[PDB]
């Protein structure tokens, strides 16, 4: 919640609030460990 | 100043007239040697 308020704050000030500028290269990794096989990830669209 | 804030599209408008701040680096000098090519010529297309 306090995350959705702050990109709501950066909102309504003009400022782009879902894009992040300083890990660019960091955030290509997909997030682990849930990222496996459909055994291990019973959910698909966080697979995806 | 030019960021449109939401730069993550860079869609091509082919007659499409948009804003100086909507204006990508990539067709910048592309458009500025399309004019370069353009202004020089004679006949009925010439900018003279």
């Known amino acids: 919640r306090i995350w959705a308020i702050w ?11 879902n894009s992040a500028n300083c890990a660019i290269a960091s955030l290509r990794k997909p997030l682990q460990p849930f990222a496996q096989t459909s055994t291990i990830n019973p959910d698909h669209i966080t697979r995806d | 100043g030019a960021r449109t804030e939401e730069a993550s599209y860079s869609v091509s ?10 204006l990508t680096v990539a067709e910048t000098e ?19």
Do not use: D, E, F, M
Not at chain 2, 30 to 48: D, F, I, N, T
């Open chain 1, 7 to 17: 990109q709501a704050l950066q909102h309504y000030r003009g400022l782009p609030y």
């Open chain 2, 13 to 22: 408008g082919i007659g499409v007239r948009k804003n100086i701040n909507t």
């Open chain 2, 30 to 48: 592309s458009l500025k040697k399309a004019l370069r090519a353009v202004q020089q010529q004679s006949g009925p297309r010439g900018y003279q």
